[model samples]
Target chain A: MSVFSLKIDIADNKFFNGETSPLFSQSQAKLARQFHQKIAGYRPTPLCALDDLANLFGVKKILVKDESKRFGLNAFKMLGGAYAIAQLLCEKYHLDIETLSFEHLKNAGEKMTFATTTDGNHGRGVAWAAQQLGQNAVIYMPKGSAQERVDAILNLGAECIVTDMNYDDTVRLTMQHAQQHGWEVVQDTAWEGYTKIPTWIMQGYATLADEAVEQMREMGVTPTHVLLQAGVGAMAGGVLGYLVDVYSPQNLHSIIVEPDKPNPLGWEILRNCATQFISCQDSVAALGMRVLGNPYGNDPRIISGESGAVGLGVLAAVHYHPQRQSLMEKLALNKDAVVLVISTEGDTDVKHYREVVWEGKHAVAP
Target chain B: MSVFSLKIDIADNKFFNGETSPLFSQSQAKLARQFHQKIAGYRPTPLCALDDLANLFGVKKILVKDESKRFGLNAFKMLGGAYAIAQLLCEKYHLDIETLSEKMTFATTTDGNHGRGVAWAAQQLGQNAVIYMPKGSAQERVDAILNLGAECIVTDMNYDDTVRLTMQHAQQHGWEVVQDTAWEGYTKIPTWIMQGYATLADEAVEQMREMGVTPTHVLLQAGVGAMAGGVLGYLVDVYSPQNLHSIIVEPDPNPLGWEILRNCATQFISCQDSVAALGMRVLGNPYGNDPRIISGESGAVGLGVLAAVHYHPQRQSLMEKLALNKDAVVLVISTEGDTDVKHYREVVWEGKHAVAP
Candidate 1:
């Protein structure tokens, strides 16, 4: 494992109270039981080998963790945000755990309405959860966001809020409105008083890490390094928590991949800073270049810049101070790492998608 | 389970076989396994429940084994015959079992080239078959059937007797033609032949019987009840099958359903005869004053007849047969049970489809 002198001072920040800090150990108990009893007959998703990736990168084993089959959201957000919303709704609204019906829970008054600001995946996840439980929802996104994402939210019967500015502005606008309207915010990014929701989001992601672990066992191989595209630290935190439990520096490396232009996590390690916003990669991959696709191309570009910013933050944490970098570098990644490139949105991020992936083809790019 | 007999005598002076006999069990093995697996999946059709039927029959339960979902064939005869035909080809040509595609199995090798018949599903099961097509075949049906692995043996694009003469001249002709329209002087009545088609139909009704089905009124369908006939007679034989007043329903447009109803099987029970072939209804259900609707709405009367026939059968099976009457009774249903009924906005059968609950 490469050594790390991580810099982002997340140690002082407490995401959630002890009630939900350790998410996997908690969700696993019920999820395991529910799976065996209710969804035990779940069919296995097809395993597609990344032959192109292996040959291009000169690696013997490259596997694409296809998240398209994620039953509800059609993306990796299937694990984190959806379950987190479900869990919070359960506690906040006194939802009955006995019955699985959304109507039953709502009739019992577990149907509390909440709001969220998503570039794409996170917003879709929350909207879907709200729809399933029969609660009305308001989703906030920037003006430049794709029509497809807006269409998806509306299709699920959620009210969509389109702000005529950037993501950060949209987030702040939605947050203020939600606060005044008494709607709960399920955002995955954190501010001083709003750390709990993001924390739960982080905890929810542990489910995917657990699934990957079991999948590795079945493949007769363990992930030597995790080359993850970091954003807001929820996904990275989830992976870190799982790795800390079972793996060691000898066989595990956590490589935070991001656009070279917006390298915040890298900058944090190099210059030592902590900030809410950061620069992003102007170069976007093409729409169809995305691993997951619906009728439209990739996810709307509204989330792409925000995602790039999160990558910068992760780099800052990993490469900031000497001591932290030394500790994080040991996070261990093998050269032939079993990296999971998550397609966060289908046919999203049109601008980068066209320029980078599809050559000169006519496509909407982020 | 309600006890019922599924036995058959196969030989009641029908044809050249001279004596009555049962189809060999060996011949049935491949077709049975393939048939059951397709039904298990939502491949060819859906085994949907008849909720409305349960209420009307005053029964405990009612479930409709729907063949309307069958790929464009609209009924059940498309299953076993195609499969048996394919199996015969495998044995005849010395094709290796492992390598045989569904197309090879069901491809009806007629005269000069091979093609698909009504038994197209056998190719679907084998995933390999060839169709001999003339240039001017109907594009729509061709596209639908071709999806089942029926490749065209492209010819001069015109109808010719060459295809027929070639089949007749083959040194070893092994293809089984399970035809609805009968030809001259030949009868198998053998269990695995046309009887296999009968078995498929019975399987659905049998499920109703096991679920404690009891029909207050039955609607049997005809388009050559090559399949429905088997199930109807079997339903009569079962103690639960009888006592419910029955109606042999048909399409006014097609005339075949009403003709079959007024004929053989209907007469076998009502009039104690086998040779009669005409449309008669008042003789069987005299006191039944519920008016029989003709096609006057948006669709053709013929189309309505077929649809009505299908719905009648489904309603009786679900409500009267299953005894789910408290849940749903008054088994009145839209007699037009085809895609043609999609034009009518009232009483949509498949709305919010009950997906294997």
Candidate 2:
């Protein structure tokens, strides 16, 4: 038997409906990218091409956006949360993003604090933003979240609380406490009375889309297929919305990959038509971690984490899995197509990563 | 207390002092890099700038060449081994380097590192690899290669016997053998392997120069002296001896590179300590230890010197010898990390000393 088994689904993009404008525009994404570049210690993350995976998937080329090196937090989720935190400060304190500096934000405040609930990466982002702006942060993580992730947030000068609930519940409770304690609730997912913050969070994710589009132009090729693996779907939606506006509907084949249903409700909304939403066994995520990719293998610097590698894994599954041939034809994934996959994090939980990827064993529950 | 104990020694440069030109020239290094880049998954490994390390060492800058992602094997050893495998195929099949295609199978033996590189190269080339491991090789090592989809056989023999059997098996199976060790008829493959390592050195040089920085000191860890020697050869040529100082660190018990450079020893030595395999116990490397390139020290020496200067009796003198002042720039290569988690934790994370039998 093969090392991994994959379950394939023809994704629906019902929400987007093939509209290629308004949700996000090039001008808006450009503004977000410019905003991100102003953040301290910001550098464009590497856009790696995986020729081996390209060959395996029968695509002309494959590109992976490696976020492990992003701001030293080992994930790209920071881009959204940190930017959203800044926007929140900009609105509350009447500060201008262009004119106000981190120092200005810090000194102009009444010792302000930001709170967020995360599975791992977003809390670290909020904490990092709070630390950078000389403010404070409080992080609440769902049960089974790794202590390493917690320690990472704490190291960034945030107070972390592991709550006995699922991810969505933790977010709800965090919002409740943030209001009760007068903390800014900088959550990523949109809900009743909370759509604006999440919209800003998604807008921040447009920075990645901007970078990828620029990088592809530099390489003189555009992504015929864009594969994204998401947790809360906020980042995925942002990226999907941005790319849809950039590439014509006929030119871009977009995919959304998710893990096991920890929260089926979240997946239900994220499961849109016109976009391919693939659900692979969560165990296969560990296998995806094992799928070491140097998407730019021809040259060797890009490294990927599990979430980062799974999209490429799904792309390969399209080529290798017998049932996915029709899916391949449906998506027009042929030898001429150029694909893009993003490795979203590094070894955040090193011990768990080693067990799953190296030992070929299951991840110890976080 | 730290998990690892280090021993410190000032490295000598007897060989390069006599030479006006370099052992490995720039054009040759470029060729290796071009050759390496053609291998499907080849990217330049990250040259991480460790600001914390620079502060701790009181150096102007510190750069670490993290080999954890070298072609996804998490070690730099594969660069040379894989490049050599490709070179061997080119020579044997008389095919063009870029356009040549094959599904041929290759074979090799390893304590661990070299085999993985060979296997990774084979898989990348759309070829197959059959690897032979010594009896009682760590399961982690075996599984890492196996995960790459290579067939692995753990032979019930010592490391040397495993090497011999691997050569025999390759011939019996009509497979091309790509071993890194040198013998009477087996010298060229080792040369190719060492030369391939120069590509990594070339990349590091480009990265440092891109950052507009130059290094005054280099501390490298060696197994079989191939990685250190190839890197040392390339850097010494590019920077010249006046601009750079090269130090080779190895474990004391397996001081193959050190002993050879210290006294011009010619004999090949096999280390009995399993951990000694971490740094190859080859007493001599025909390709690496040219008279112009010098290397010295025990396995843990780099970390030892790193720790020792803080507490050693001859701290100031050692610092001067290594140029470890605030003005000096140092580069260190962390060749691999936590290869065997249980063993690495005991020796490094947990600081476990080996117990006597």
Candidate 3:
């Protein structure tokens, strides 16, 4: 039953240490929310409850934020990218960020190029944002990334260069290229000196959390647990940071998860906010994809990709484990617990999606 | 790629002569359907079209007759059992099957759904049932049988061994044995059982015509093969036996279906347990926008053939011999639902019968 090879690493955050950065404020997120609302086809993505899955996992409820419908690009990433680009352009032109429409963003004097290193969805988001504002984007991808995603970027008129380097190396190359060409490096990660734009990106994610809170309120339920999939941890920190602000860090039991090869660059916020951290097997992501794609009774089917589904994969893995009761107890997951998971991306890579769900690739044995 | 052994052993009807079988005649099937209609809560089960799966398999269409909805008993075996029981009561009482009332103890041995059907039928007729099950039979099935007010006795013997026990016990206790599978000197009730099962074929033929579908290929799951036998024999009456390519999926993946297959089958697939597992998985979580089918081990083997052939890396070699293409409208009946939910989850959720690397 331990087939998933889960690292149930509980990292308790007893102390509050995340700095009071102005960009991580509720006001900034509200302003970003206003910015997003002005964009065409902007609506809150679905917050669906998996009732049958909740029963199987022995929880009260499981709500998944289906971010695949976030924009035409099929990811939650555009929320950050569009907001960041809007903010970046707004500051550069000395324009009023508050009263900005997507049309207003277009009227900036000089046409700038946005470039980023991505696993897949983030680059698409950046490229899509650049295209939306009638600008240019040059996207660099890591080796072994699916060609489908590269094509998706190219479809947005972005120069999608699939590099034979890993994520960090690719990021370095993108940065070096950005310096040479004066292309704005619209990355969602933060370094010592480059915290402002990344902070804006993270703050952009808080809108989804705010939307979820309202949706949950209307559903007549309050979440007891929040599980967010962490790649470099921007989304996790972003979403979790907002949630902790709402429920307070001491009250909200949140867990951050990463796929088989694990990070977490959102170290400060996650350190102060997250209660547990799980680095799961890649197969768990496959299982999660299958689970979400073909949901249990009455649960809305979500076309969750590998990166989007790991949080659910971990929760479901706990249900099937030999030490299920103990694991459930350790995670503070009881019958009274209501869990919220964000399915951050769709099947951005369709071929591998079919392999995992249709062909039963990485299927766990009984 | 050869997950199941193929025998394109073409046998002509000259061996048995299909015309002489008065038991499987169209009139008897009509009689069976009329009798079933008299029972309350009886309706024709759904004949669902898996158009999405057909698109995936490059077939014209794929239709599944869901027997799990049969009289709300979760299996098509009830079609046979309830009909056979109605026949017995009518014969003994010498009255309309509707007017007949008796307290007869019916006995049968089953792996699961067969006994459930028998027990359910007897209960519906205001009679008694004594169901004996084989070893390793799932507890959920036993409980379902017991819940029907039937005396379910699970034994340590296999299915054939338990059948002998069932036969002896019925003989000793003066209970009428209503087993579907027949042996030497036990042809009458089995014959009636096959006739009773013809209701599915009758309903399906009507259903296909309504949807403008003529099944080019038919796949039927087999055990002792009575269900397949009844369905295929009746289908041959509707479509040409020479033209209709019938494939019998087995417990390896038979009886009357065996007899009919020996006469006029295109292929007899001697498959492994893997096929059934794959079938169960595929049916439950179907391709594209196909409706989910809840198929048990016995119910799902037929569809497994398609899934196995489609996904196996070297499918090109086997796919050529099967001769399935865009024009072949495949029809397969899911004989039962998740009768053993524990094992059902083991296959679908846990991948117990996963295809070997």
Candidate 4:
């Protein structure tokens, strides 16, 4: 049996200094609550208790926070991107929305609009934000992007352009066009100079964590472990920050999990090589189909391998790290361990969900 | 001007038999409240102050208790109907609803369930009731009737035809169908049978009255006038039942506006009866061309007057009773208030809504 309770620690994680974050500020908290009071109707969904999942696994507790009703938007990406856009346009510009025509905002100043490159959710966020704040928006997507998604963005009244290349090419095109036109890019990932928007996106994630913390207390159960899943690191960062600051669950151990294939970041730190390759079947076509796999995709370089399986991609050349071995030894019965996994994206790797979460792929006796 | 007052002297009335009703019964009250709490959700619909209507009518206050979202069922007919059915069958039978097939109480004994008249409403009163309404019977309407907690009687399938035929046969054979059935021979209104229901219905009428609605020269209003008619009837019965009987204000000063309004030709509006209220013309095709009226098969004569109004010859006597001035200074208001004098003729006089007290 795989031992648990090995914590994954990050380096220089002091993203928040003395000055409070505007995105996750007290004002934002008030705004979120007000928004909920207006639109987010409280439905009494049944609690699928963690004890049930744990009992099946012969483990401890496991909690599943079902968020099917995220304002009828389906995904929860609307929180950060929309808030940031509204703040930047309405509050900063002092443009009286009632008085000024939408066409007038474009000519009022040289403040170019925001752009986003997305597969499904982030584009929706940008479109919704642009529509609400009465600003111009352009969303970039790959040619093979589903017609339904393309149709959805267009329905939000955003200018959408389908490019010939894959997701990576679309991202590059968006970056070049944004820089060329002097428009601000509200991206969800951090690269070179693009850090502020990503930070705001991560901060927006705190609202969910805040809700979870308050909910757990209400239910009278403190989770002992949080099995957070990282996708480009923003979600995990916000959750971890809240847990460390607010909840402080005693004997907390975070087990971050990722898919076995294409874990680019995991291969980098363990091998200590810039270019590590495991055998990737050339037929894989989902993301952009272009090879823009980065070394920091899963945060393994910043995270300890002991938390969960650090990296398990075909091309990543994942090595047996001592930290992972340590997790195997520590996760035991007397530890009274609790495991929480964030089921990140439902439709990601369609075949994978069909085999796993949907088709009921049980975790083989680890 | 007719004097209208809010004060109702119940002790002075003739119908106050001095006994509590089943609706106000402690056990039934608990059941009613429980049923309401569970089914009627907490959506605070505003009690609109009908200031506009009040200003026009010149009443001291006007309050329209808008029960619009009684979840789209409209009006307040669900309460007693639903609760009464449930009390009789579902709870009383104590049959294993899950294993409803084994129970033969419903199958063997069926005495034309008055509770069962409410197709879907009766079924929802309980599982056994539901099982009884097997083919194509909905639970929503059944649940509404069932909530009243009444007796349940399960009959054979073919619900619509069964209900109509059963009610019709009960009428023909004098079986006292558990329905709000109309009997040709019985003239006595079942007023005091359920005093609580009458009282509640009266209170609802008063709520309309409080919305500054005192019929000085009462205009056109319909639906049993339970609220409109009942309150008026109750007031007439209470204050001046014996002292001053209401005389219909016709062109020739008729006593009741009922006959004039139902036929829309001689007068319009307050005098015009049901026709002017719904924009229907008198002697229009729908009613005018009714073959049954033209057939003129059977009748008797009781009047001997020159230039008779109706062919059966009782028109003179009817007119005589209708035109008795009563010598009291009474106001004439048209009961047919809707702006439909012509279309009501075309559509057939069928849109008359039920007025409940």
Candidate 5:
């Protein structure tokens, strides 16, 4: 617990002044969900509630939005990448997005290629979309992107390029090439002139929130808080914003937990405005995988990766921190608060996960 | 623009992912604006568009939110201090703020803007104010506070030391210290001060929207990051966070934000060495740092970025990567008009004449 440093901020809810304009309209969300429902193997991920952990934290219930089998891609990013590709194809081919099919996208002549850069998940989504659409994809990965992850994208029949730069620079290179070669750039991160497509990607992410809200409604439960963890802020921001827009939660709280150190320039903003940031030492995160769950005995066993388990680690830290009592009280967290946490991936890096979770080997903190 | 250094932050609107929720809702903003509007001389500050500078920088537009004449105080500090004083009074004495005027004294320490704000608020509330400044503090700044009929003290210490001394003395006298920096149990007043700053952000956004335009970038002057935090906080709430790219500008010597961003460390700066109008020797907010603001102090970095896109080796590509092209619409806050008349004469007008037309 000493290694787990907690910085807590209370949400001012400055934006919560009774104006209830929906963030994503029902019509738009329906369009986005329809795009995903048409995709092969599209189904709602299970919202598994962990009762033992809820008892441990003294909470009523804990709901986990399991994205492990999202579109059979093992990550939630598939919804965005695939939906973005469909939109791009419709724009380039001058066809209607509503009626366009994979058969209509199939080409026997010169192939239309899509290019993008990713650490891992987004590339696979792009690659899988291209394969289904009968088009070509060029994926650029940053240096140190796991070879297995690179192969995962290649498995979907896309040409993968490993760049010598970091993730941000690699994305820049991909954008440059897309501009120079006239290939459609489906990169998710939006910049000045490159916003329209990413908006589509964000709308695609809204489906997860839409589904989770509906699932909770059927279950007759109102989760008190949400804990979202991500590599970048886009997915968390999208889902959090959508939930805030839909359910202007007087009782429900939103907590964003991140694993990696964010890009420094943006880190300043997050450090100031975030309600609380609990950064676990990499060793603790490594230790977390070893303590995954009572899999052999528990009724609802959970398998979470190093990144996946970090949110739970934060919940533990909040409970443990002697100084964080005020923050905890402010968040309305207690025995009755039903919490929801989304685990984005499930041991996507199996080799590393087994090394840390099973073999008990500690990776050096970067 | 000699004292200006520009670094472009590629807009990573981490907060803008299809969230149409207001950062700060309009109702809270109306409540805040209502508090300020009831003040004796409350009025919306000028949203001055510098077209010549815009043409010179080659951007779509450049709007400067001039807070130089806020409440006739000649600086923007009056709004926060006055609003905070009203709240504190109402909370403690349960007085109706619009007509309530008490004889209680307010004590605070300052390098500039905040001290004047405290003094002005005290004067408005029919109370006395005692302001302490560092030994080497400028006479004009002291006079600005003294002009409002507040007692001034020039202590033999630096700015941070003076703040600590003032806090101790305020506690000793049982007088309230309306300082902006938040410490252990003294956060509520500072938070209110920050909320008061929301009016500035709200007004600017409304003024821009009325002109049928919105800023793509905002260059804010940073001291303890109070104003920047409050303003940016409201802006992020009002606009989709991605719509506004926030830049923090300070003196080159004060790399408080830069060093902290580089390696989460508090690096103190010398007030004398810095050339910025709002120069201070303090680090960022001790309570929490806002990650959205990218701070620098070279000289006119936004325009510098624009100039680099045309010249400078290896800089054009970097500028391109930053998206600081002709399509950008930028906004900057001139928090003060001319706080130090002598310094402005010697530093800006004298120095920049050789650099630009």
Candidate 6:
């Protein structure tokens, strides 16, 4: 019996102390929810139950918080960008942040410019927010990013540049470009002395978490586990912080799943709140993309991007690993385990998504 | 830039003599259809037009004759089994071959679909059946036969040897052998089975006609040529052998397929198991807005061959060799559904038997 596998590296979070920042508090998340509710096209994204898939994987329940349904931009990142842009505008115009509407921010600007460095959903979010609020945006992408993503930002009426450098270098280039040109840098991650905007961005993500909690309560089910996808850990930190507050961290086995790790302020929050961290082969994300796209009987198909589907992929890899029982025990997964995963983005790179799903790129031996 | 492929062999039918067996005629197909119609729950299975998939594959049309809808037993093989069983019982009882029959043990060996077809026919006609499976038969298949209230014995032998064991058991129990392949003394039921199978091709012809379309090429999945011979045999009669380009795709071949196809088939290709797995993957989950066809292993290889040739790095060469062009209206029959539920998921969900990296 040849079972497919990729190398997986998991570690218990020794940095975890069950302590979280006030930025992830329920009150601020509720306030962010109020801000998003007043936006032109803001609707709470859905929580889909993969009942059939859960049975196949021998789990009690699988609730996928589908962020692909958010904001018609096809990602959860738009929430943070829209909310952060709104907060930035509210502060600029001396408007109340508590009860600010998108209408309140629209005419209250000096044609300010927003800048960010991303070749993916984050850039699209910034571009769309700037375009909607009648401001200017310039997106800087790293070398080797897909032209499709760059074109996506360009289509939103934002200036997109493909810098001849890696992602971190591209970020530096973007910051320098913004400073020299008097543009405000709206980034999801933070360094020292740059925590407020990043915190606002994380709190925007908290809105998605709130909706999932509400949806779970309506279904009369409580999640025993939560799998969070972490790249820079902004989305993971934002969602996990609120979950730890709502469900009590001692009872919830929260795992931070990442294909690659980059430490930001979100990393600090995740380290304190997360129970474990799982770093897996990039192929696992492809495996997860296939699983979500082509679902088991009658399960609603989820078009999760690589950045969105890695958490589920980690679970699937564990389920198929030779040391399945040990891995499952380590992750506290069992027959009665109820897991929640957030599909943070859709087919952001359409060509790559199809390649991974249809053409079996990064395919595991079967 | 690697293109996955099997050693495909193509030959123009120098024997393109338009001559067909009298049994593979329009009149015979209509008669078989009439007989099938009298059976309960007999309806023409759908011919799904995959317009979007056709566009992606650079074809004018792609019509899939979905036999999964046949009789709710999930295959086109039941047509042959039901019709053959009816003919056998009619002759013994001195009744019309178009009607039903009594309780007798109908025996056969199969890889699953064929036996399930025989068992279903027996169940429908109020008869008993005994099915034999070769070694490594899936438990889900065994359970399917058992669920239909039949005896299924797994003989620890190869497929041909299992057939011999079934024949021996049939002789000992005084049971009638219902096999699809032919031999020296056992050509009659096999002939009836082939004639019965013509009804599927007949339906497809009529469906295409109603849709105002013409099939320029047909890729048929064959097993010892019974289904292919019957379907292609009828197609040859309707469109004339030279007009319709027929390609036979299989994991096995036989004289029956060769004899029927010698004058009509444009190619004979035996493909790998992974080829069928690719077909299952692509069909179960389709492109654009094409409807999903839950084709099983045996039924999916023809589509797999087409996909392989389409994605081939040297696609123009392969397409030219296969005589496929942009205007070619390709017709492929998904001969069965996900009969092996566990196996189907393993391929589509778990990436079992995936296309090689």
**Highest-DockQ candidate:** 6
lDDT of each: 0.41, 0.65, 0.80, 0.36, 0.62, 0.83
User: Which digits, one per residue and each the tens of the lDDT, describe model 1 over residues B104-200?
Assistant: 3223322210133332655544544444546554454355456655554545535444345324433254444433323343233212334344444
What TM value does model 5 have?
A: 0.46
**Candidate 4: stretches off by over 4 Å:** A1-50, A94-112, A262-335, A345-366, B1-357
- lDDT for each residue of candidate 1 in A1-366, tens digit (9 for 90 to 100): 112222233221122221212343445433633432332233333333454434433334444344444554555564566666766766766764334555556576334677888777778878877876677788998987877678878888888888888888888888788878888888877666776666556655655565666666787776554544556556655555555455642344445444333222222221221112222232222221321111111121111222322332243233323465333434321245454433443333443332222121211211
After TM-score superposition, the amount by which residue A79's alpha carbon in candidate 3 deviates from its true location, in angstroms, is 1.7
**Total residue pair clashes for candidate 6:** 0
For each candidate, what's the DockQ?
A: 0.01, 0.04, 0.28, 0.01, 0.01, 0.35
lDDT of 2 by residue, A320-357 (tens): 45666677887778889898878888777765653343
TM-scores of all candidate predictions against the true structure: 0.39, 0.54, 0.91, 0.36, 0.46, 0.92
Give the C-alpha interface root-mean-square deviation per candidate: 26.8, 13.9, 4.6, 34.7, 27.0, 3.6
Tell me, per candidate, how large a share of the native contacts it keeps.
0.00, 0.00, 0.14, 0.00, 0.00, 0.21
lDDT of 2 by residue, B106-204 (tens): 888887778888888887777899999988888998998998889999988998888888888878988887877666576677767777877888999
How do all the candidates rank in terms of TM-score, highest first?
A: 6, 3, 2, 5, 1, 4
Among all candidates shown, the one with the greatest lDDT: 6
* Candidate 3 global CA lDDT score: 0.80
Give the distance in Å from residue B78's predicted Cα in candidate 4 to where it truly belongs. 43
Ranking by lDDT: 6, 3, 2, 5, 1, 4
Least lDDT summed over 10 consecutive residues: which range in candidate 5 chain A? Answer: A263-272
